[PDB]
């Protein structure tokens, strides 16, 4: 589906609604029908929903790189003048919501509508037609939302205690519906390591062999030890799918969704990814993932590491100032001294950040971000290239958390501009190549 502005839809379907409201006694002749739409008399809207029903439309965003840049959707009248786009098709369209626009086209002929519903329909195109990998796979929020759901926290609330001598196990629940009643109360945590008896879910392949080996269990009850979230997670996958019981990194989700496309019809994957979306968003907000000057911290070893290599460069700078050192080798020495010195700050930085820090969770889960990016935020941005392409031996000791200096900032733009300028001519040339491949 897609959200279509009611005003836009009315004009697109103008000739259609004109006939419908003339078939009905709303208007007596086609002349009255036309004016009845132009001035937008309230009767047309009820008529518009009918003509638009199950009538597909094509949605394109330029530049169109691969055929997935155009996909059919079922229109839905929406309040406002903007277009509502499904969050899972952004990957294909490369669509950012920073102000991008999209074109709508109305297939008319029976063959054209058939092609839209069959060939170009949104849910039928999931894997990229180049690598076979999944594209509509959850991303960026749905990732951290699920990653948080499936993760297992040691010492959580209500954790299965493996009780001894005076108390039964204490970590068992009659059903998953009980773990919910226990989660709503302060008893249970969604990230606990409790064990539950499940009647409506399927166990892994290995354990299923040892547990039944006579068949499977649609109602036959079994028990495994998983986080309450991992249970709810598997409730999103098809009932016929084995229980996974892992914390979902993005690659792990790619493995699973990639597997559904081999073992299940398309409509099954279309609906499974829909359920992953709703679940991912709900837990993305409950994830408690924000940003603050506090959640951004620096490793205390940065001072010693920095001042240490400083003297190592001063000594080499003293060796070059002594006249014996080779000028090309001096800078190359400094470049090598500072290059791996950045890795140390990166190593010390990762060691410092607790695993549950909101900044690293975003990068860990594979939702978005790199470590090299988080190395410039806190710690040190590192060396920067000169305009001629050479590596300026003067490093950026400061990080964007502590703020750069007048000279540090002026030097960074030297390279930052060349990169942004490259992206300009990298699309004009890449497009000139694709036109020759196509031809």
């Amino acid at each position: 589906q897609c959200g279509l502005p009611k005003l836009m839809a009315l004009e697109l379907f103008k000739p259609f609604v004109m006939k419908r409201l003339v078939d009905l006694n709303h208007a007596q002749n086609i002349k009255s029908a036309k004016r009845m739409v132009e001035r937008q008399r309230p009767q047309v809207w009820d008529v518009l929903e009918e003509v638009i029903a199950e009538h597909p439309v094509l949605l394109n965003r330029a530049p169109t790189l691969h055929r997935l840049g155009i996909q059919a959707f079922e229109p839905q009248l929406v309040e406002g003048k903007a277009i509502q786009l499904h969050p899972l098709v952004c990957e294909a369209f490369n669509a950012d919501f920073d102000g991008d626009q999209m074109a709508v086209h109305l297939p008319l002929s029976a063959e054209a509508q058939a092609e839209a519903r069959i060939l170009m329909l949104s849910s039928n195109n999931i894997l990229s037609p180049a690598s076979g990998k999944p594209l509509a796979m959850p991303r960026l929020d749905m990732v951290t939302g699920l990653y948080y759901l499936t993760t297992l926290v040691e010492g959580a609330t209500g954790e299965y205690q493996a009780a001894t001598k005076d108390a039964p196990e204490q970590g068992v629940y009659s059903s998953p519906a009980e773990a919910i009643m226990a989660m709503d109360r302060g008893a249970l945590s969604v990230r606990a390591k409790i064990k539950v008896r499940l009647t409506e879910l399927r166990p892994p392949t290995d354990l299923e062999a040892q547990l039944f080996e006579n068949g499977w269990k649609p109602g036959d009850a079994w028990t495994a030890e998983t986080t309450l979230g991992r249970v709810m997670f598997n409730e999103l996958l098809p009932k016929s799918y084995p229980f996974v019981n892992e914390q979902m990194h993005k690659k792990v989700q790619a493995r699973i969704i990639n597997d559904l496309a081999e073992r299940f019809p398309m409509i099954v994957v279309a609906q499974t990814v829909d359920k992953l979306k709703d679940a991912g968003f709900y837990w993305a907000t409950r994830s408690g993932v924000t940003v603050s000057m506090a959640d951004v911290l620096v490793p205390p070893q940065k001072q010693e590491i920095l001042e240490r290599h400083e003297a190592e460069a001063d000594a080499i700078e003293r060796k070059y100032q002594r006249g014996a050192l080779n000028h090309t080798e001096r800078n190359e020495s400094l470049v090598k001294i500072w290059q791996d010195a950045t890795e140390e700050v990166g190593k010390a930085l990762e060691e410092f950040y607790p695993a549950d820090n909101p900044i690293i969770t975003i990068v860990k889960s594979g939702a978005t971000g790199n470590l090299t990016q988080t190395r410039t935020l806190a710690g040190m941005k590192g060396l920067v290239t000169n305009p001629k392409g050479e590596f300026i031996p003067r490093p950026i000791k400061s990080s964007f958390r502590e703020g750069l200096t007048v000279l540090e900032y002026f030097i960074n733009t030297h390279g930052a501009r060349k990169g942004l300028a490259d992206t300009a001519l990298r699309t004009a040339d890449s497009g000139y190549l694709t036109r020759r491949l196509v031809d």
């Binding site: 950012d96 929020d141 951290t144 305009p387 501009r417 300009a424």
Partner: protein
């Protein structure tokens, strides 16, 4: 204010847009304090268009000069000398911020310096000649208005500067809660604010004009722009910020412009922000707002269009502006006056008539 102060490499007598190589687009060491390196187009015009720096100055010969405070024997004097790029490399430029010693002397053991490379090196403060007038010499007016500029990468900053120009004046025009130094200085130098040129007292204050009775006995008056359609449709309305009996001083702010409040640039509003992801509605740079921002008209703005029609002499007669239309209902003309032009204060809907006109017809058949 940035359109003027804009510097272009295009046009006759200079390299054209498509042919120029990337070597010119790159920043140069001599751009410091003369042409802001952070403010430039994102598109195909990168590096070919830039804005003059804050303290920069143009020479009678066409070369940009930058203000410096010369230092002699580790002491920064009050002598300020504008130097061209050529003579700048001749000397050594100390850094704007360096520890100051009580009456003026280099306190730090060594001082930051800039060479003709340019190169960055040190001395014990004895061999320095000139120092920077202040930080943000390299920065432009728009760039200098970004709080915490030093913290943001040049990429996102460049976007930040280009987007200030694209703001639109609101109805309330609230000033920034956390700003920089340029807010008030840039508004008055823009010209969209009303400044008093003689010390005196206010005689009258009306939405129409503001009169001041100077100590000189002379009398100045200022007619206020009211809901003037800007070049791009934005509202150029002005509002008075002074009362009747108020005293005023030469160069003060009498009324606010479109995007100004109390003399300083107010390009937006201050809003209560929450940085949590929320139910997949603010996702992939999308945003969600409180409906309060609609009921209270905090982000409301006025826009004005100009429609035009003429009645010329046709080979088959003369065009006539009239209320009579060949085939129309008496209702479609309900908002037209005698002449056939829409009546002031009426509402107009897509397709409505603004000015009735008719032209002669030939050989109908």
């Amino acid at each position: 204010l940035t359109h003027k102060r804009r510097l272009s490499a295009l046009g006759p007598g200079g390299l054209s847009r498509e042919r120029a190589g990337l070597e010119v687009r790159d920043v140069h060491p001599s751009h410091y304090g003369r042409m802001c390196p952070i403010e430039t187009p994102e598109g195909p015009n990168i590096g070919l268009i830039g804005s003059l720096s804050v303290y920069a100055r143009v020479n009678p010969f066409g070369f940009i000069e930058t203000p410096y405070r010369k230092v002699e024997n580790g002491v920064v004097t009050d002598q300020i000398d504008y130097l061209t790029a050529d003579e700048e490399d001749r000397h050594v430029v100390a850094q704007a911020n360096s520890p100051t010693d009580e009456n003026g002397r280099f306190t730090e053991d060594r001082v930051m310096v800039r060479k003709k490379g340019g190169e960055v090196e040190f001395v014990s403060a004895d061999q320095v000649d000139y120092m920077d007038v202040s930080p943000r010499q390299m920065v432009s007016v728009a760039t200098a208005m970004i709080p915490f500029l030093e913290h943001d990468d040049a990429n996102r900053a460049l976007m930040g500067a280009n987007m200030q120009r694209q703001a639109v004046p609101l109805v309330r025009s609230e000033a920034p809660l956390v700003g920089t130094g340029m807010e008030l200085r840039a508004a008055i130098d823009a010209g969209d604010v009303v400044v008093a040129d003689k010390t005196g007292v206010i005689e009258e204050v009306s939405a129409d004009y503001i009169t001041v009775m100077a100590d000189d006995g002379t009398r100045q008056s200022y007619r206020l722009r009211k809901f003037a359609r800007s070049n791009h449709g934005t509202c150029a309305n002005q509002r008075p910020i002074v009362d009747a009996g108020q005293r005023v001083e030469a160069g003060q702010v009498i009324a606010d412009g479109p995007c100004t409040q109390n003399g300083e640039m107010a390009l937006g509003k201050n809003l209560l922000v929450a940085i949590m992801p929320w139910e997949g509605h603010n996702y992939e740079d999308a945003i969600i707002l409180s409906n309060r921002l609609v009921e209270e008209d905090v982000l409301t703005s006025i826009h004005i269009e100009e429609h035009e029609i003429d009645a010329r002499d046709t080979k088959l007669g003369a065009e006539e502006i009239t209320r009579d239309i060949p085939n129309v209902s008496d209702e479609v003309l309900a908002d037209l006056d005698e002449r056939g032009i829409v009546r002031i204060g009426a509402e107009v809907r897509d397709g409505d008539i603004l000015v009735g006109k008719v032209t002669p017809k030939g050989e109908t058949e």
